[PDB]
């Protein structure tokens, strides 16, 4: 059954291929043709095994990792992707990254997705704001999942993207690294514009900065009061504490 049956030699990727058997797709469908017209696959209602064949073709064609040409239109092939394979990928455009993450909506960060992001960010060089926006959209609890030392490398610019709900899972050792960045990030912003944004990062704020906030008529919430460093609220006086209330 090596040869493709006469007449079934597919010149184009189309809906006819759903009728084909596993070996027929392995015989008839050329890999080079599939790679070019990979944008059609998500349209065609293929079966489980049929996709495995299409996936196998790409490995044969691209032993050294797929190009971004193909990656963009992977779709539900991404689900059947090996972790080592993704390490080869050189993804750059964020529109690529969105499409991949949109196949695993709702679910937890799969091994594949985890390996994709680490490779993505290495390629960029730094964790961008635009990067964070997309990551936090699909996976809110990302920043807290990063190890404290990795957060040190994170530029102050990216803190714009972070939201109050994103830091819920963060332990205080992470907030100690994020606070000075947030402080550098939200600079030149006088008044309540300072306060409203820093609310969250106060969880890792020294005592010297708490005395500064007291005298600027902030009127801090009492919910925020509770989420402060126990060690770094000892030098601060009750007089100073009263000015935050
Ligand atoms: C990624 O880029 C490196 C350096 O240009 C190259 O050696 C490698 O083959 C690329 N990986 C891909 C796109 O398969």
Author numbering: 299 to 543
List sentences from the manuscript.
Despite all the progress made, information on the structure of full-length MSLN (fl-MSLN) and its conformational variability are lacking. Here, we report the crystal structures of a 207-residue MSLN fragment, of fl-MSLN alone and in complex with a therapeutic mAb MORAb-009, as well as the structure of its C-terminal shed-resistant peptide complexed with mAb 15B6. The structures of full-length mesothelin and its complex with the Fab of MORAb-009 reveal the interaction of the antibody with the complete epitope, which has not been reported previously. MSLN has three predicted N-glycosylation sites at positions N388, N488, and N515. Glycan attachments have been identified in the structure for all three predicted N-glycosylation sites and confirmed with samples from cell culture and patient ascites. The N-terminal half of mesothelin is conformationally rigid, suitable for eliciting specific antibodies, whereas its C-terminal portion is more flexible. Our findings revealed the structural similarity of MSLN to ARM/HEAT family proteins, which suggested its potential cellular functions, and shed new light on the conformational variability of MSLN.
The tumor-associated antigen mesothelin is expressed at high levels on the cell surface of many human cancers, while its expression in normal tissues is limited. The binding of mesothelin to the tumor-associated cancer antigen 125 (CA-125) can lead to heterotypic cell adhesion and tumor metastasis within the pleural and peritoneal cavities. Here, we report the crystal structures of mesothelin that reveal a compact, right-handed solenoid consisting of 24 short helices and connecting loops. These helices form a nine-layered spiral coil that resembles ARM/HEAT family proteins.
